[PDB]
Amino acid sequence: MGLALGRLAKEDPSFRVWTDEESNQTIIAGMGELHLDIIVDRMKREFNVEANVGKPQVAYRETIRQKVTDVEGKHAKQSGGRGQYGHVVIDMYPLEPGSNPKGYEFINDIKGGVIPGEYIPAVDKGIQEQLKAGPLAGYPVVDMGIRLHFGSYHDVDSSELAFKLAASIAFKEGFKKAKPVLLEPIMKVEVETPEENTGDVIGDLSRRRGMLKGQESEVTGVKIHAEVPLSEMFGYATQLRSLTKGRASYTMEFLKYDEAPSNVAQAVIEARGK
RNA sequence: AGGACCGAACCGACUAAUGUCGAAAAAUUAGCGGAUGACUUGUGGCUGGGGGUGAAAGGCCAAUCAAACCGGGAGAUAGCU
RNA sequence: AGCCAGGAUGUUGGCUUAGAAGCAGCCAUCAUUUAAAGAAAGCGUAAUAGCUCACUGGUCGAGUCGGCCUGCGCGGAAGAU
RNA sequence: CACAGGUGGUCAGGUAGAGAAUACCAAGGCGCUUGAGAGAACUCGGGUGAAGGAACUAGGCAAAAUGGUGCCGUAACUUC
RNA sequence: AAUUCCUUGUCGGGUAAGUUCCGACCUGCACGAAUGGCGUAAUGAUGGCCAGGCUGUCUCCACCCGAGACUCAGUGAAAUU
RNA sequence: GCUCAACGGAUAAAAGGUACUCCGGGGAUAACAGGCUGAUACCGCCCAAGAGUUCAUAUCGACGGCGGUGUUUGGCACCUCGAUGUCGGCUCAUCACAUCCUGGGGCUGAAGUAGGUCCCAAGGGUAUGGCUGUUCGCCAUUUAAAGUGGUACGCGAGCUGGGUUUAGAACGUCGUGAGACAGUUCGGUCCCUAUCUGCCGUGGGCGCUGGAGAACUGAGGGGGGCUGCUCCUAGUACGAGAGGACCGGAGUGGACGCAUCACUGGUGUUCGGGUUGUCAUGCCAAUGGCACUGCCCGGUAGCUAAAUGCGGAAGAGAUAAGU
RNA sequence: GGUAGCUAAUACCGCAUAACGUCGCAAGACCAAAGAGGGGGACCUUCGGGCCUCUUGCCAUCGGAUGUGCCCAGAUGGGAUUAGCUAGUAGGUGGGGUAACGGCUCACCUAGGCGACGAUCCCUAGCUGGUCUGAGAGGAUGACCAGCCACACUGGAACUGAGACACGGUCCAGACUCCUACGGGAGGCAGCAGUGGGGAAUAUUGCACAAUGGGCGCAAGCCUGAUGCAGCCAUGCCGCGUGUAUGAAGAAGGCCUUCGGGUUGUAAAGUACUUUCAGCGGGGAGGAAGGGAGUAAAGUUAAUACCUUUGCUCAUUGACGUUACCCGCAGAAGAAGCACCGGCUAACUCCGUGCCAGCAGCCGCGGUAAUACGGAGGGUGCAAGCGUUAAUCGGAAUUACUGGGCGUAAAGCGCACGCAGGCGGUUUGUUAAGUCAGAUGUGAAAUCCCCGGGCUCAACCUGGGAACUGCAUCUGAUACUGGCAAG
RNA sequence: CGGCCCCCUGGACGAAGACUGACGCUCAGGUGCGAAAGCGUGGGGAGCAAACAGGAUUAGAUACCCUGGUAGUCCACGCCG
RNA sequence: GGCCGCAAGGUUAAAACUCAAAUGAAUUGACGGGGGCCCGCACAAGCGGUGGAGCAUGUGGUUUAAUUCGAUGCAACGCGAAGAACCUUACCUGGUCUUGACAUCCACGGAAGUUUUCAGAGAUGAGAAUGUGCCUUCGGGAACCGUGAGACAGGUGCUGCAU
RNA sequence: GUCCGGAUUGGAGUCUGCAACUCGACUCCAUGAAGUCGGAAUCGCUAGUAAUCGUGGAUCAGAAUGCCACGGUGAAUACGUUCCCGGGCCUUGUACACACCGCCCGUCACACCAUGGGAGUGGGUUGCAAAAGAAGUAGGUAGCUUAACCUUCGGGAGGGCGCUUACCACUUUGUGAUUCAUGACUGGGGUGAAGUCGUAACAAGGUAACCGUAGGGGAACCUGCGGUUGGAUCACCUCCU
RNA sequence: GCCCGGAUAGCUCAGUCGGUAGAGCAGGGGAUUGAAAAUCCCCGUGUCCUUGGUUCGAUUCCGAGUCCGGGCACCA
């Protein structure tokens, strides 16, 4: 597949191939679906590479919708030679979406040296490792603040990674109590169409959950703007070409990480769990 | 040499067809299995019914067996037809 | 009842102010030219319009419109020699 | 029952054959106590089979097949 | 599994396709150590399964050859009603 | 002086199994089958929340409403216990229509192709295999499609007997035990000559008004009716493009039926030849007999299908839904 | 392709005829051949010729040289978790066959043969001179060149020929391309280039027969992808070069800095100078011996002809090749890298990142002051090269013959007996196998080494010796080992 | 290898003489012996004691410790090596 | 895999892979539920206490705007602190100023100082009055208060595992 | 629960100090708690000591139940080194060396790597037993055809094509041997900064270890029988001539 | 289906015909005696299956309910 797609990208620059870093899927992109159809045909004939054609996996994220306080995590494993003691108490709270470029906030509010300052980075690191694989469906956790304010150590049995284990326990229990939700991307879509073909474009966009922001009547006709989920923005090239008799051109860009509609989010949560 | 091997006589009786008011109240035609052996067989006796005999099925004891057959109790009984 | 006419400016009114425009929708849901227009019945609009009707004029020029109580019928009603 | 059944021992030939098998005959004895026509279906004891070769079926049941002496050759496992 | 109900369990081998067959996993409804457990060369008119030879078993049946059926003359039943 | 507690108390004293079974009875009473009924099952319809971007009614249709059929699991015990052979398969069917295909249309969220849904329609047609006892089901490959059901869950005086259903046995389990188990495993008698309805055929008598030999008319009745692909129409109508036709025409095939033997083959124990064992013809030579025609190699006429001709129409009339 | 006629020859076939040829005890028997060219006196011309003379070929025989075939011995990988193997197999006689011998092949008889110093089977593999290594002994390995062997799309066979069981020949079957009129054909780069592929990776679809070598020819000659040269590639070795000389404020700028200075460092500019080599333009050996016309002489002959043999002169024979080589000119101009700098190991510090990013051959460095991780100055090695990786030997006396071990570090079988195998007291004699000595034969040349020479030197090329450590023979020597005999 | 006794029997050693005359050393393969525990058959079984049971102990103690206790230890013949 | 064995198993006998060591003797220590010996309120023999009570004080913990910070087996916990009402004070809220409260240097202006008033929680702000001394080159300088300049000053900020 | 105890709370004060609200000391009047000798455990002290009684100081404006000093009164016991704690010397064992708070073993859980077995599956190479017979030779030849040699000169001799036989290539079938690959599952081995359950070895490692065998058991191991030292300890006390 | 029975600390029961519960183990302040352990001296952890009523004045009685399990559901 890699070899075949490389040859096709070399002869046709308008054809792009990348691996999506999140899904690990090979994504192919082209100047229309009939274009991609010919590319796929050549790949599975000239090179004869057996492949399935699907849709770019929507980048699902994870977050909470409820502050939880006083979440205890106590890794107390005093067994097997010497013990490993670690004890942390954290508050977990949602951030506003995109309010932090890091998607994560850590507040150290330890008072009284209940935790030695040397173990605080190991607690933060234990949380940050758990943010990579969320407790709901195993997607990355975003838009969340954690305040470490209470904890305890043992002079002989306390370890850096023991406090990291305690942090993970506290996080997993807190996250389940915090009403966890599955997130979604939304794509800003712009469609240029003749004025007489305008109507059809939006009829289909409405079925594709496209929140029409507005329109900019241009010389060709109308420049309609809509917020459409990535999931519903697939196969649009040929669909538009059908509604507009082949005189329409759209563009799309990633807008923001909004909340997936309860129905959509829950359906995927169940499917992932299965 | 062998409860040895292949196969007739003799002894058995797996399979299919027939015949099933039959040729015959269990056999015939076509293969089968055993065949010096815990082999088969003629003639003469011994065990008698709640008992015999049984490489053991309630199988056999005169086409009669979870208790024969044949006289007598006895014109058993029968709230059943 | 038809056959010829018209069937508005405020008002793209706003709430979401994206505009939600007389026609997805709580809200004026009036005063006027008036015969009037509900400040829109109804299709048509991504979102207006569009084409029409409520209302009114002329016409030909008679009865006519809508429920209730009862008779009798019509449909609903397709099965195996 | 003038019944395609059962009944112990002796004698036991020629040619082919390992042979009392089996095949044709010898000595001897018999045609089986109902016959004559036609030459449909169908039932029975048998023969041949185009191309395909278990696709039939409960299931290779039945049928076809293999089939003799000499010599060459002979696997896993095995209590050798 | 001659033992497993569920259950055609699940995975692999075999076939175009395999509730049976073969080898395993172990969640043994409800295996088990002389009411013996587990293997085991050889043997078996023993159950299951596959490949081959070869064939009218079959797809789909045709023609031939003898004994009955049909007819001619003689003898002449039976179950049942 | 009795929990004689089965309380009108059969004894002072009493528990099972039978598929090894037996007798006497019963449709007084079950299983299989029919009948009445129709909860359930199946198909249809009523109200229309809401879904369907918008919009109840293109397509689904909640919560609730009303009926039809006699199709499954049942209720009843009406027929049969002096016997109704009781599942599945084979062979053979035949009606019903609530229709899987081919035919005719209406709406579409019907561009075209292809489909979604409902109405009219019973003329014909409606696979072959692995596994299983399987109806069923899953799978593989086809197909114009592999319809849903009455018919004693059609059909055993037609067939098989694998399953359930006798006696042998064995495993697990339940019992002290005999023995039990819609729990399992291996084995395991299917009987009849057709009297009378019925039915496929073929004849005798009389009759039909004098007798006889021919030819037809034709009241009435059966058989028959299916369809694919390819080309042309045209890569046209339609459509962004991809794709892609109705209406009409030609040809060429599969399943099924009809007739025939000219062609390609089968058979062809009555025709020719080869040959093994043996006997006879007096012997040699040559022939004849018997061994499944002895075993085989060919094959004329007939009979045959795998072979080869032909079919199923058009047209017309009156109509269904609809226009 | 087919048919029917015609024509030549050093093509083909009988005879004559032989020997020191073949066979056979002999006697006998029997065998073969081919002719062409130049010139000419008389002769003679059927007017070609005959005839003489010269040059070469043929046939037969005995030799020599070259080449080829066959045989014996010894050496020539790994494996015993391969121990038995074989029936033309071992041999004999007889027949056949081959250039010959031979189980090369048949017929019969005998029952052999091989094998623990390794038969049989399996795996691997072209062998050698040699090459790389090593102080040697050894270990690795067969690039290059040269000798031998094997193969020529795969399998098998033969023909022709002195010689193939045949790279650019034939026939058959197989697979794979190509043409076709569908009937049948055609083809084989492991020759030179070239292409696609495969791969980490290996070159131009060049020119010329000028010499050497080959083939044919009496010669001239033509062919020769042998060869002689050239293109492309640092792949390697060797050589030369990007100047040399002066010149301190010890400049600027760079970094270090106790910030005093140090360093880059005579390094630069400048100035004084030269022109190796690419540049430009000219001169310009040698690789060439020959051969040919002419000439003249000597042979040769009947003949000065012709031909043989020796000199003279003339015109000439170079793909390389705008040759090297030499001479002149203009301009500092056209010409320097790469690795490393913790330790082993030559060469040190500053800055950022902090068990993160990583580095590394080994030990190890990195957790907030990193000579080790990246930049900068500086240094060091090497140099048109420099690093890594792979690969062999060395170091490794870690397979120990030279040249090691086994009381406890790895290692004495549990112990014994014993066949084969290995080793053996002492005295004398003999032989002379081992061993030692001398000589001959060979041990190809190249390559290594030595002393020399020739390309400006070097690499490269060459002369002689040395070596080839070996085996075989002959003559010896006889201590020692062995064999034999008496002790 | 251990009471004592008998019978059969190996090997070593010492002294003074005699004899044979190197008849020698070592040993791959080969053959023989080879504690204890196991295994086979048939006996024997006091003691002792794997397994096993009970009591304690212990956090648990399927161990030490306690009480029992089968194989086994014993003999004849083999095997194992 | 072969051979042997009734079996247990024996005998013969590898390779992938992985590590940079594994091992031997001896040495100094350390440690021994090893031996000898020996010492101390270590024990034995005694007296009086803590742990229960209430209070003082320190710490842990939790609370809080902060509850400053360090000590935290013996060898921290009436410890740094031989003394926290403000001060101390490093902590907290709020109000403030920046070459600065503390030093050296520069340029200017004013003796320095003193008294007193308002505004302000205070820091400060605005003043209002008065004083006007010392050495003289008096164009002075510097004891001293302010304003501007850049050097710098400040840090109870971190690291006792740099010292 | 007292004329014991004096914690607590109300009012009344005095002083220090700018200042006593959090947050000072002391006086007065009133109020009068828990507590009736202290669980498990554990601390001090060998003579002017333990115990009790009171004074002064330093810090400081004020602010001791603490610290630092001072005198008063003034005990009990110590046979003794067996035992714990710590230490010193000598000898011994050791697998310990940021040194017994040391080392370190094997189940079990997860990921990974390479292998053994595995119903089998697909290749390679090859043995055997046979079948097969192109082309080419070699042997035979009923048949057709034929220049040069010969001929009684008719035709012979001899050859060629053709037929056939022997050898043998492709090719086929059957059955073995060996090797490469793969196979659900499965046995063990290795590796993996900080897993779970014990703690088997190293000291007499707390039952001396280890070897062979046998049995058992979640592990390490434990028990029997034999063997070895690659095992320490042999000193004190009672007694005796 | 039929029948029976139960549900009590996190777990399991003790216990009950009577409104208001015991133990360990998981959990313990303090023990243990470098440290912890072990967990030792001693302590707790429930609403005793729940309600609704009846009333030894309900988990209990009685029914309901909620759930699970057990034995039992065949014969033609």
Beta-ladder partners of A259: A183
| Any strand I atom closer than 7 Å to A150 CB | yes
Instruction: Give A271's DSSP letter.
Output: H
Per the structure, the residues numbered 165 to 224 in protein chain A that have their CB within 7 angstroms of any atom of strand F are 203, 206-207
Q: How far is the CA of A16 from the C1' of E28 (A)?
A: 59
CA gap A10, A15 in Å, rounded: 8
Task: Please tell me the number of Cα atoms within 13 Å of A83 on its side-chain side.
Answer: 13
Tell me phi and psi for residue A184, to 5 degrees: -145, 145
Q: Which tokens sit at A126?
A: 């234990």
- Protein-contacted positions of strand F (CB under 7 Å): 52-53, 239-242
- DSSP 3-state of A224: strand
- CB contact set of A186 (below 8 Å; sequence gap of 6+): A227, A228, A229, A230, A255, A256, A258
Residue of A114, A94, A92, A112 whose CA lies nearest to A103: A94
| 3-state secondary structure string across A133-197 | CCCCCCCCECCEEEEEEEEECCCCCECHHHHHHHHHHHHHHHHHHCCEEEEEEEEEEEEEEECCC
Residue of A190, A231, A192 whose CA lies nearest to A60: A231
Task: Please tell me the number of Cα atoms within 13 Å of A4 on its side-chain side.
Answer: 16
Q: How far is the CA of A91 from the C1' of F127 (A)?
A: 71
Instruction: Give A257's DSSP letter.
Output: E
- CB contact set of A245 (below 8 Å; sequence gap of 6+): A197
Beta-ladder partners of A104: A144
Residue of A207, A213, A251 whose CA lies nearest to A231: A207
CA gap A145, A100 in Å, rounded: 10
- DSSP 3-state of A51: coil
- Protein-contacted positions of strand J (CB under 7 Å): 104, 193-199
CA gap A185, A206 in Å, rounded: 17
Instruction: Give the number of residues written for chain A.
Output: 274
Instruction: Tally Cβ neighbours within 10 Å of residue A186.
Output: 21
Q: How far is the CA of A57 from the C1' of G96 (A)?
A: 91
| Any strand F atom closer than 7 Å to A245 CB | yes
CA gap A9, A45 in Å, rounded: 16
What is the nearest nucleotide to A247, using C1' and CA? F240
Write the Ramachandran bin of A103: left for phi over 0, alpha for psi from -120 to 50, otherwise beta: left
How large is the greatest C-alpha to C-alpha distance in chain A, in angstroms?
A: 80
Method in brief: cryo-EM
What is the nearest nucleotide to A160, using C1' and CA? J194
| Contact between residue A130 and residue A90 where contact means Cβ atoms under 8 Å apart | no
Instruction: Tally Cβ neighbours within 10 Å of residue A177.
Output: 13
Q: Any long-range contacts for A26-31 (C-beta under 8 Å, 24+ apart)?
A: A26/A1, A26/A2, A27/A56
- CB contact set of A71 (below 8 Å; sequence gap of 6+): A89, A90, A91, A92, A170, A171, A173, A174, A177
Task: Please tell me the number of Cα atoms within 13 Å of A95 on its side-chain side.
Answer: 20
Residue of A108, A68, A73, A63 whose CA lies nearest to A92: A68
In the block, residue with structure tokens 């992109």: A29
Residue of A202, A198, A132 whose CA lies nearest to A168: A132
| Contact between residue A120 and residue A100 where contact means Cβ atoms under 8 Å apart | no
CA gap A28, A159 in Å, rounded: 48
| 3-state secondary structure string across A94-122 | ECCCCCCCCCEEEEECCCCCCCCCCCHHH
- DSSP 3-state of A19: strand
Residue of A121, A146, A120, A119 whose CA lies nearest to A131: A146
Q: How far is the CA of A167 from the C1' of F46 (A)?
A: 64
Residue of A193, A195, A188, A185 whose CA lies nearest to A239: A193
Whole-angstrom CA distances from A153 to A33, A69, A141, A167 are 61, 20, 28, 13
Q: How far is the CA of A181 from the C1' of J4 (A)?
A: 72
- CB contact set of A247 (below 8 Å; sequence gap of 6+): A193, A194, A197, A220
Q: How far is the CA of A118 from the C1' of I85 (A)?
A: 39
| Contact between residue A31 and residue A14 where contact means Cβ atoms under 8 Å apart | yes
| Contact between residue A185 and residue A63 where contact means Cβ atoms under 8 Å apart | no
